[PDB]
Structure formats: structure tokens, C-alpha cells
Amino acid sequence: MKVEEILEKALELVIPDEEEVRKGREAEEELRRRLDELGVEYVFVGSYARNTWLKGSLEIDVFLLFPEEFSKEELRERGLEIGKAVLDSYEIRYAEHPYVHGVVKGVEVDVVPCYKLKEPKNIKSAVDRTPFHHKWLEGRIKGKENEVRLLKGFLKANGIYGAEYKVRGFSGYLCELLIVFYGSFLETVKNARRWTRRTVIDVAKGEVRKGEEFFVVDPVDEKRNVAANLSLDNLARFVHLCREFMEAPSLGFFKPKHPLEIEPERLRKIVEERGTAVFAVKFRKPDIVDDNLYPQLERASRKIFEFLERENFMPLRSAFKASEEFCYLLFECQIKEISRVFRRMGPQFEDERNVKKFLSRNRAFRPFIENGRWWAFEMRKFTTPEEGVRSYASTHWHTLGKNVGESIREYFEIISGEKLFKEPVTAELCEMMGVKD
Amino acid sequence: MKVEEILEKALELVIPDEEEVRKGREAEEELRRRLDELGVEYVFVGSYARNTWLKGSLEIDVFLLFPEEFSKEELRERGLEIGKAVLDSYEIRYAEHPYVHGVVKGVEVDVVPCYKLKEPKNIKSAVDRTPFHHKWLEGRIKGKENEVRLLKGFLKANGIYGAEYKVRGFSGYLCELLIVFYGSFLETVKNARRWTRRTVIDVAKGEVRKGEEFFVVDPVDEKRNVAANLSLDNLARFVHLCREFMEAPSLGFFKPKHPLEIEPERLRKIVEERGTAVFAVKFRKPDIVDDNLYPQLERASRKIFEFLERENFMPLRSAFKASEEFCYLLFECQIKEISRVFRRMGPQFEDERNVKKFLSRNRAFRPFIENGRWWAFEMRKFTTPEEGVRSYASTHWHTLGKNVGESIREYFEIISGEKLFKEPVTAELCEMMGVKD
Ligand SMILES: O=c1ccn([C@@H]2O[C@H](COP(=O)(O)OP(=O)(O)OP(=O)(O)O)[C@@H](O)[C@H]2O)c(=O)[nH]1
Ligand SMILES: O=c1ccn([C@@H]2O[C@H](COP(=O)(O)OP(=O)(O)OP(=O)(O)O)[C@@H](O)[C@H]2O)c(=O)[nH]1
Ligand SMILES: O=c1ccn([C@@H]2O[C@H](COP(=O)(O)OP(=O)(O)OP(=O)(O)O)[C@@H](O)[C@H]2O)c(=O)[nH]1
Ligand SMILES: O=c1ccn([C@@H]2O[C@H](COP(=O)(O)OP(=O)(O)OP(=O)(O)O)[C@@H](O)[C@H]2O)c(=O)[nH]1
Ligand SMILES: [Mn+2]
Ligand SMILES: [Mn+2]
Ligand SMILES: [Mn+2]
Ligand SMILES: [Mn+2]
Ligand SMILES: [Mn+2]
Ligand SMILES: [Mn+2]
Ligand SMILES: [Mn+2]
Ligand SMILES: [Mn+2]
Ligand SMILES: [Mn+2]
Ligand SMILES: [Mn+2]
Ligand code: NA
Ligand code: NA
């Protein structure tokens, strides 16, 4: 319905509602009140400050600004003190150096202590450059706030907003840098059609060039890749969505797909048509934060995938899910049953001592020579992919992530069939198998 | 029972019997009679001449010796004429240049025409060096005739005597050169324990050295490998048999193993225990000689093996058999059934034009991105190895050898199970699966 009219309608799905904007301003004024009474110098940074936050993601970022001559724990101990006095409730979170996360009048706030540096040139981590992030964007982004919200809404409706590990998508700072570089949502989307996995966007030089990896150069620190947490596959999904949108634009690109919600009977039918083995490893969810859990689920699922490939079960795809109580690692394989017998490699015929050792073992069938080398028929200890994973998980839990592995050691189950379709995984199965509406 | 006493007992299994020696001498005298009346110059060569032929392999080789100045077809036309006058019956065989094979008083004779060269130095093929083979061996092998017969009997009882393609073993000329080089059967067997696939035996230089392939240098022609038709796997089998014999010598090494002769019920049991797919391609045997047929059966069986590997049926081993009326190509696979669905590779995400073409095809399930590249779920046209070979044999017969392929084009069958155990292939199946006594 013409690109320009679709973008006007999308603004209603992307701009926060009335009670959100008011809820936020009440919390900000109260927060100013408490900090001012303590005599601390501070600055509100982030998407709240710059009026670029997406509908439904209200969150207030504050940095406490201190004299340049204070030690490492003079900023840690003192900075925390103020953060605990100013919030209704709090939690010691850990991004790189510890900060405070809490609530003020029912609104999430982060309080981060750092130096008051005149000019940046002083490297440490991402914490100490964040004030300079705000300083660089403030007033380069003025007038373009809705362009930022269009880009964030687009990305969110398609599951790729956020740099946290559950997502591996686009951060808020990244969205704002893109809008500054290209000028608008529409120009971002038109130009991203030509991005590659080697594209380097150098915001401070107004330059695009080729490199070894996808790299967005932080204008505050030339060694920092702002797109570091963006996965290759999510970059690919975004380039394809940009091409599709420009080919046939729709308001539907700004709305989240309502899920498949299939009945166990239709899934049973689909699994019968495909002729595959479909199963899950179930275990208790360890008590750790998402940014620690999700890298472990990814690793555990890859190590089991690699086992299935090496054992000739021909895995197609894998997925994983965490609920409140349990985690699930999901697999589909092309092979449901393999023969008991397999071929084990022995030595070359010339090597007399090692040939004697190879032929000494008792076996049911006779070894043989093929292309100058000895081989023997031997028996597998499992013949289905479910039996294989039971064995792998019981013995090699120590490679499946520190905490995920320790949980599997205590308890796991392999589930298939009518039992599997009753766990909260039908949505992940459907996506993994490419099931249509 | 002591190596030396075993070798004395083996001489009875290796030396021709009474009526064989007499049957041969009658045919030789008659043959001399007929050639002498024609005024042709000739010489008896080969294992008959030198009294080195194994029990049960009586055959007389004659070469007709002609003046040096006769053209290529002056030796072909004239040489044939004499060969047809001298034999009771005949056949035009083809080794390299045509010769005559027939019978005299119930004994096989070959008559080959070639030049009467003073000194060898005149290269053409293996035909024109054969008189010089005899000349070089005559009287180097005197006194060692039973040593040669021990070596041939050893090799025969173990299925590796003969350079013809059905066997790919040791020729008679090769056995005689080995006995000259090492001095005896026992010294041959002790030294062959250390042969490798790089061993070069240079009989004329009294030297063993290393090369690129196993090579026995003809003392008449330094460019000719006398062991050219010996397979790598039969060289390996011979080195291992030599090691075993010296470790625990037995008369049993000179006797042929009496076969397994299993009942269909025991084979059914074994196939059930292994859990594999076992099947054969059956077709009519083309009307051609063995040295043409066996290379074609080997090729056809390899091309089908390579198909099964490429289609993920995990073939273990293959074999082949020709009876009087039919041929059989035999296979055992680890996978009895594979899923209908498989993963087809598409283009990298960057390549917009080729991505559009890939996503245009109608399919039952949705394509997906993985590690920067597009993939699609598609459906196989067969799910068992038997169904796969039916398809391969029907469409790609043109790669299965000229004559074997043309027969399969006219008629073939895939046979498994209780039907398979009733064809004359149980012995080849047992060997292929390493079945024990
Ligand atoms: O791990 C890190 C490191 C550094 N920072 C830095 O802290 C600042 C605030 O981090 P946010 O991710 O909250 O940025 P935001 O407010 O712009 O976006 P949304 O909440 O709307 O998603 C950003 O400017 C970033 O540079 C992180 O956010 N996370
Ligand atoms: O490339 C490979 C990898 C692994 N393997 C075999 O599979 C097993 C598991 O290999 P994994 O890599 O899945 O588990 P792990 O890290 O716990 O390995 P280990 O420390 O226990 O060795 C190993 O014990 C190895 O022998 C291979 O044979 N080849
Ligand atoms: O293809 C060829 C080429 C050449 N020759 C040459 O012709 C001669 C006779 O060929 P034979 O193989 O009949 O030799 P043989 O008589 O020594 O052994 P057996 O029959 O007892 O097995 C051999 O000396 C060889 O060099 C072939 O036999 N075949
Ligand atoms: O390495 C290979 C070989 C073969 N193939 C595929 O399998 C088929 C049969 O490959 P074959 O090599 O078994 O038969 P052929 O000689 O008759 O091959 P064509 O002349 O018909 O091509 C071919 O059509 C080829 O596409 C591969 O995909 N990869
Ligand atoms: Mn924020
Ligand atoms: Mn924040
Ligand atoms: Mn927070
Ligand atoms: Mn930075
Ligand atoms: Mn392990
Ligand atoms: Mn002969
Ligand atoms: Mn002959
Ligand atoms: Mn003959
Ligand atoms: Mn020669
Ligand atoms: Mn073909
Ligand atoms: Na195990
Ligand atoms: Na076909």
C-alpha cells in the first residue's frame, strides 16, 4: 500500500502508548530528586534519555560521574553505595564490572559508576565508553527518533532485536548508529540489501569498505565492533527481509507472526510423512542467568549434533528451549535404525607386529584385507539415535557446558513420540522442520 | 610336523600323477611328427618343456620360428596355416597378436608364430619375448623343478595361482623367476615375509630395491613388470600366508579349503544378527571370454558400490559371481531404510538472483538459513538400498561396462531374502560376511 503510507501506519505499533510515557516521567523525576539530595553528579543516558525507546521497552539508564583520581575500588564501593540508596529495590548485576539494577516507581533502572574524563582517550572496557556513546549521538539523532523506532520495531517483529545471547540480534546503540549513517529507516533498509559478511561500516569516516568480518566501527573507539554479538545467520535474515520488504511492502513486517499452535495429531502425520526420528533430551534448568545459560545450551546441542553425525545417524537439524523448570535439546535424524555390524579399521599388511595384535581379539566374524589394509566386522552398542544419545549424555556430560553438564549428570530423559508432543516444544519442532500454515 | 617333513608330504599333492605324464608325452611326440613333416622350425617352451607344470594343469606351448625378413602379416597368415594343419581341432584366440589354441590326442596346445631373432634387442609385445623367456630359464631352473611345483601348489590351494583376470594372482613365469632368485620354495616364503607394496625385485642384477610399485623386472626386457597382473590384495594375502606358514607349518596350506555349504536357515539367522540389508542384481551372462567379462563385473560392482556410498546407504562390502547362464552382483549395506526427507544445498545469502530462483520452487516444507547459506527440505525417490539400485541400474547401465551394461539394459532383477538364498551365491555371501565354520 505504497511504502510511505505503510510507514505512517507502522508508527502506531512502534511509538510507546500514553500511560507508558507518563509512568516513565514520574520515575525519572523521583530519581533526579534522590540523586540531587546526595550531591552526586550524574547523567541520564540510553534510549530513555534520547527518546528512542521502543513501545513496551521502558528502561532508564543512569551513569554516576566521579573525579578522575579515584582507584578501581574507590569507584566500585562508593558507586554501589549511591545505587542502593536511590532504588526501591535492587540486584547486583554483572555486565563486565558490577553495576546496580533495580526499580523506581515500578520502572527498571540501571545505575553504573564510572570516571568523569575530559576527552575519551582512556581505554578499559565497554562501561567507560558509554557516556561517550551518549555524547556522540546526542543531537546527531535529533529529529530522527521515529526512524530509530521503525528500525527497532521491524527487527523485534522478526525476532532479531537485542544483543543478548538468547537473541544474537541488533543492539539499540547499533540501530542508532545505522540511522545516523544512512539518514532514515527506509535508506537503511534499501542499502542493507547489498550488505555482505565482509562489510565494514565506519561511521566516523562516513565510509563503507571490505574487511574480514561484518564490523561496525564505534565512532568513540576504532577497535570496538558495535555489531560483535550479531550472528551470521541473523545478519543473513535481515538482508533477506530488507529485500522482501522493498519488493512488496506490508504492515505485516511490523507485526509478530502468531504461532502455529498445531495439535499432536497433525505433527504425528507430518513426522510419519518425513520418515525421520524426532526426539528430545529433557533435564532440569540450572539456576543461572540467560547470558550464561544460552551459550551452554548452544554448545551442548552442537556437541550432540556432532556425535550423531560422527555415528552415522545423519542429523538434519537441532534446536533448544528453556522453560521455567526444564530445558530441552531437540534433534531430527534421517536414520532411525542402523545395523548392529560395522567395519573397524586395522593396520596395513606390511606391519607384522600390529597385524598380530589386531587379529588376536576374539570376534564373531573373520577379519579381511581390502586395498592393502586389514578390516574387522565388530558390533555397535546402540542401533538407534535415541540409544546413542542416552550413552553420550551419560558419559560425556563434562563437555556439555559447566552447568548444563552438571544438571544432565544428576538427571536426564530421552523423549520421543506421543510423549514428546505433550511437552512445551511443539512450536520449536514446527520451526525446525519448516512446517507451513 | 617340522617344515622339512611337511614339504616332503606336499610333493605328492603337487607332482602330476602317472596317467597325466603319459597322456602328455603321447601328445608331444605326435605333435613333433606333424610339424617335422611340414619342415617348420619350432621349439617347445613353457612349463611342459621345463617339467615345472603343476598336477592337473597339463598344457603344451609351441612357438614357430621363422626367418627375420617377413612382414607383419607374412607371420600372421603363414603362422596360422601351420597351426590349423597340426591340431585335431582349433580356436582363434587373442592374447595380443592372434594365436591358435586347440587339442592333440586330448591335450591342450597353443601354437604361436614369431621371429627367429639372434639376440633379443627388438621390442614389440610379450609374444616376441617368450622364446627368450624359455632361453633364460632353461638350465637356471634345472634341478629346481619340484621347488617350482611347491610354490604353484601353495598358491593354487589358496586361490592365487594364475595371472588371468578371474584370479589376479601369480603367473607361472613369475613363480620360476622367484625360485631362480631365492633358490627354493622355503627361501622364497621366508623372504616374502618382508615384501612391501614398494618392493622391486631385479632378477638380472641379483638386486632388491625400493620403487613406486611392486615390480619384478623381466631379465629379458628391463621395462617389463612380470608381476603386472598381481593385485595389491593378493600380494598382501601371500605375504600374510608366508608369515603364518613359517609360524606354524601344516600340510593344510597345500590343500584347498572345503567350502562352508550352509543351509538357508543359518544364513537367515546370521543376516538377522548383523541387522544389514543383503541383496543381489541378477542378469544374463554376456557371451564373451573371462578376461573381458571379469574386468566388467569388477567395474559394475564398484560403480554401484560408489552409488550406495554417495546415497548414504553405507555399503560394507560387495562381491560378484558368474554362472553358466546368469551373473550376480552382491551387496551388504548398514542402512535398510532412510527417511523420505533430505536437505538440499542452496546459495549463499548475498547472491540475490540465485536465492530468488532457489525459493521459487514449490515444496512441502519451508527453506531455511544455516551458517550463511540457504538449504531446503526435499523428498527422495527411494528409501531402501534395493529401490536405489533398481533406479541406478535402469538409468546408468551405460557406465557398467560395454557388455555387462547392455545385458542389464535388456533384463535385470533385484533379489533379497529367501529368494536370494536359493540362487547359487551362498558361498560368496558367506565369504563377503566373514562367516566362520
Ligand atoms: O554489555 C554492554 C556494554 C555496554 N553497553 C552500553 O551501555 C549503553 C546502554 O545500554 P542499552 O542496551 O540499555 O542501550 P539503549 O538504552 O540504547 O537501548 P534499549 O535499552 O532501548 O535496548 C549503550 O550505549 C551501550 O553502549 C551495554 O548496553 N551493554
Ligand atoms: O573427531 C572426533 C571427535 C571425537 N571422537 C571420539 O568421541 C568421543 C567424544 O568426543 P566429544 O568431543 O563429543 O566429547 P569429549 O569432549 O568429552 O571427548 P573426550 O574428552 O571424552 O575424549 C571421544 O572419546 C573421542 O574418542 C572421535 O573419534 N573423533
Ligand atoms: O599374455 C601373455 C603374454 C606372454 N606370455 C608368455 O608365454 C609363455 C607361456 O605362457 P604360460 O602362462 O602358459 O606359461 P607356463 O607354461 O610357464 O605356465 P603354466 O602354463 O604352467 O601356468 C610365458 O613364458 C609368458 O612369458 C603369456 O603366457 N601370456
Ligand atoms: O561424484 C559424483 C559422481 C556422480 N554424481 C551423480 O550421480 C550420477 C551417476 O554417476 P555415475 O558415475 O555412477 O554414472 P555415470 O558415469 O553414468 O554418470 P552420468 O554420465 O550419467 O553423469 C550422475 O548423474 C551425477 O550427477 C554426483 O553427484 N557426484
Ligand atoms: Mn536502555
Ligand atoms: Mn539499561
Ligand atoms: Mn536493567
Ligand atoms: Mn564503545
Ligand atoms: Mn568425554
Ligand atoms: Mn603353459
Ligand atoms: Mn599356454
Ligand atoms: Mn591354450
Ligand atoms: Mn618378457
Ligand atoms: Mn549415467
Ligand atoms: Na556411555
Ligand atoms: Na532411474
JSON list of C-alpha atoms in Angstrom, two decimals, chain B residues 102 131 149 153 169-170 203 228 238-239 262 347 376 422-423:
[
{"chain": "B", "resi": 102, "resn": "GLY", "atom": "CA", "xyz": [43.48, -76.46, -29.91]},
{"chain": "B", "resi": 131, "resn": "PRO", "atom": "CA", "xyz": [61.15, -67.63, -26.69]},
{"chain": "B", "resi": 149, "resn": "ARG", "atom": "CA", "xyz": [55.72, -77.04, -8.12]},
{"chain": "B", "resi": 153, "resn": "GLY", "atom": "CA", "xyz": [50.61, -75.70, -5.31]},
{"chain": "B", "resi": 169, "resn": "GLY", "atom": "CA", "xyz": [47.43, -63.87, -8.91]},
{"chain": "B", "resi": 170, "resn": "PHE", "atom": "CA", "xyz": [50.92, -65.17, -9.73]},
{"chain": "B", "resi": 203, "resn": "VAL", "atom": "CA", "xyz": [66.37, -60.69, -11.18]},
{"chain": "B", "resi": 228, "resn": "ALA", "atom": "CA", "xyz": [51.82, -56.62, -13.64]},
{"chain": "B", "resi": 238, "resn": "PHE", "atom": "CA", "xyz": [50.54, -64.01, 0.06]},
{"chain": "B", "resi": 239, "resn": "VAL", "atom": "CA", "xyz": [52.81, -62.10, 2.46]},
{"chain": "B", "resi": 262, "resn": "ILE", "atom": "CA", "xyz": [25.45, -73.59, 4.75]},
{"chain": "B", "resi": 347, "resn": "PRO", "atom": "CA", "xyz": [23.15, -20.41, -2.47]},
{"chain": "B", "resi": 376, "resn": "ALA", "atom": "CA", "xyz": [15.69, -26.78, 1.56]},
{"chain": "B", "resi": 422, "resn": "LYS", "atom": "CA", "xyz": [18.14, -70.15, -3.36]},
{"chain": "B", "resi": 423, "resn": "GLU", "atom": "CA", "xyz": [20.43, -68.78, -6.12]}
]
